[PDB]
Design a protein around this nucleic acid. Structure first.
Lengths: 212, 50, 136, 68
RNA sequence: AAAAAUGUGAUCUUGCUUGUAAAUACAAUUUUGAGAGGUUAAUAAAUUACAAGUAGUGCUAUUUUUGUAUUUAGGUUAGCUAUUUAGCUUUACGU
RNA sequence: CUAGUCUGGCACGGUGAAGAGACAUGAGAGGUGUAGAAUAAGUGGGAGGCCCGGGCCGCCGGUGAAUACCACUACUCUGAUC
């Protein structure tokens, strides 16, 4: 459990061969896992926290019958109170497509009378649990929830992928994200000696190329 | 020292620590030598990368 | 233990050094040189008695067993080197060879040349025995 | 527990052109397994081929000795 | 068995993996008829139920209507063959 | 209990070739449960961006997560050794 040292961890400005598109790209962190069983009780999962979150692209489900409902319509999202929940019945799961369609949900003062129910755990470790600490109020912080925290999980492919960088925000805001990302990964890393094989570099879309 | 580098390549940390301890002496010297060999192993890995 | 050569054109040759003394019988099948063997049986394997190792029925059974083992490896024809006791004592083969040469013929083994390779001495040292001889 | 005569190849025995019949027979030869050489193991051997088997239309009582 | 939907953060009962059952004929019979083996057990085979992980899902888990009433009952699981008329397999496609 | 003697280990005291066994590196082939016109190749992908106003497959009908622009990966052979 020893991957480390920040003497020469710099000069990440070279992104001409990777990024030549019009829009802004997502530089991701991936790793190759070894000595891990996919099906049994071996579970590698956790919540890595960043301070300055660059740009996670994901959709947010918004529900409410208050001023939040009136102010969330300026985001130009298809917001709808009860017919949107009526559209998502128990038929879109019988249909083979995934009946989730949202990576985030709402937990605010409109649904605070409906939230204290028996429904507890779920996709909290997957990272689909709204809370008041991470700004899921959605009248002003709906735009700010585009910049949200990150999390990671495992599946049967036996690989890891998380979004830690974006070459809008400069690399001075991303280097501290790299510091905190590896600082939480070493702390959150059963007995497993040196799981870190090779940290990957990643952009939005493309072809393979080796650089550490 | 090249044998200790080969033990670092085949990743046997406990046997490498015991071997470096048997060669140089005390455990403080062995722990410092293991970290110095890991640092130059990372330097050689960076040199083999570019 | 298989023959890759053609079965119709040419049959696989070997030799058998048939040793037959008065109380011992070998059936030793070897190649044409003699350095590399194929199989070898003794009378003690068949009969658990040293008084009748040179038996005609046991020699017939041993010859049929060696012929079956030889057809398992795939050698069709055999030359017959008929050894005897030899030396300075006697020059007479045992009675088991007369049964064994008929048994290996009736078992289905092709017969080539038959000759003796008995170590016949011309002029040698003193024969084992006293002046008066074998008293009984 | 294994059969000894399993990994044995068969090499054909050749005669010089001054006689009639080219082929004589075959003899089990081990493969070239690493250090040892099959041609080195097949260095000194002596066969026994009669004159009637060597030359076709001649006498039969005479014999020779053929070294390989 | 298919359809309102308040819900339990909107939201279904898990084709997978791991631990448990307690089900899952005997005989004929290739050594062996008998008492175990090495059935069986333990305990990574599988169909059903429980819990975990998560491939399966926001765990746990909820409600209205329809399938009412043509309640039905009979029957096809229709063949192959022949130009047509028609002939005509208890279903062989090793038999 | 020892001179003396025997044996084993450590440094003095290296090299070239063949044979057997184990480990690692640079590369090229490399993926067909149901189903889909197609080795679903792979996950966060992305509805689009590349090149010279125009070029590609899409989103998806159908699979339990579908092609361009970012990584060598669970893993099967070829494979040259400072």
């Amino acid at each position: 459990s020893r991957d480390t040292l920040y003497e020469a961890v710099r000069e990440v400005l070279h992104g001409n061969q990777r990024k030549r598109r019009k829009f802004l790209e997502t530089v991701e962190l991936q790793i190759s896992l070894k000595n891990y069983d996919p099906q049994k009780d071996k579970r590698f999962s956790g919540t890595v926290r960043l301070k300055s979150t660059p740009r996670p692209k994901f959709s947010v489900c918004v529900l409410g019958d208050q001023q939040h409902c009136d102010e969330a319509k300026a985001v130009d999202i298809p917001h709808m109170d009860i017919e949107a929940l009526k559209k998502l019945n128990k038929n879109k799961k019988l249909v083979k497509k995934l009946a989730k369609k949202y990576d985030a949900f709402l937990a605010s003062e409109s649904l605070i009378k409906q939230i204290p129910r028996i429904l507890g755990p779920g996709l909290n470790k997957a990272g689909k649990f709204p809370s008041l600490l991470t700004h899921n109020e959605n009248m002003v912080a709906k735009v700010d929830e585009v910049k949200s925290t990150i999390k990671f999980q495992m599946k049967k492919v036996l690989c890891l992928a998380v979004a830690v960088g974006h070459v809008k925000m400069t690399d001075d805001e991303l280097v501290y994200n790299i510091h905190l990302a590896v600082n939480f990964l070493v702390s959150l890393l059963k007995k497993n000696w040196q799981n870190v094989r090779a940290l990957y570099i990643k952009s939005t879309m493309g072809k393979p190329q080796r650089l550490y | 020292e090249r044998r200790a580098m080969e033990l670092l390549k085949v990743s046997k940390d406990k046997r490498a620590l015991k071997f470096i301890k048997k060669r140089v002496g005390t455990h403080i010297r062995a722990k410092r030598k293991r970290e110095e060999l890991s640092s130059v192993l990372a330097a050689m890995r960076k040199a083999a990368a570019k | 233990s298989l023959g890759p050569q053609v079965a119709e054109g040419e049959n696989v040759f070997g030799v058998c050094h048939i040793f037959a003394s008065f109380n011992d019988t070998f059936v030793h099948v070897t190649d044409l040189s003699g350095k590399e063997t194929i199989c070898r049986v003794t009378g003690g394997m068949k009969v658990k008695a040293d008084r009748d190792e040179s038996s005609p029925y046991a020699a017939m059974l041993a010859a049929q067993d060696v012929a079956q083992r030889c057809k398992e490896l795939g050698i069709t024809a055999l030359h017959i080197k008929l050894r005897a006791t030899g030396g300075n004592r006697t020059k007479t083969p045992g009675p088991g060879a007369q049964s064994a040469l008929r048994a290996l013929a009736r078992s289905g083994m092709k017969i080539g040349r038959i000759e003796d390779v008995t170590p016949i001495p011309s002029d040698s040292t003193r024969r084992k025995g006293g002046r008066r001889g074998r008293r009984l | 527990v294994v059969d000894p005569f399993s990994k044995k190849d068969w090499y054909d025995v050749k005669a010089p052109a001054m006689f009639n019949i080219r082929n004589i027979g075959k003899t089990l030869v081990t493969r070239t397994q690493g250090t040892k050489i099959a041609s080195d193991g097949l260095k000194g051997r002596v066969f026994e081929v009669s004159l009637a088997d060597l030359q076709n239309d001649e006498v039969a009582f005479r014999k020779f000795k053929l070294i390989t």
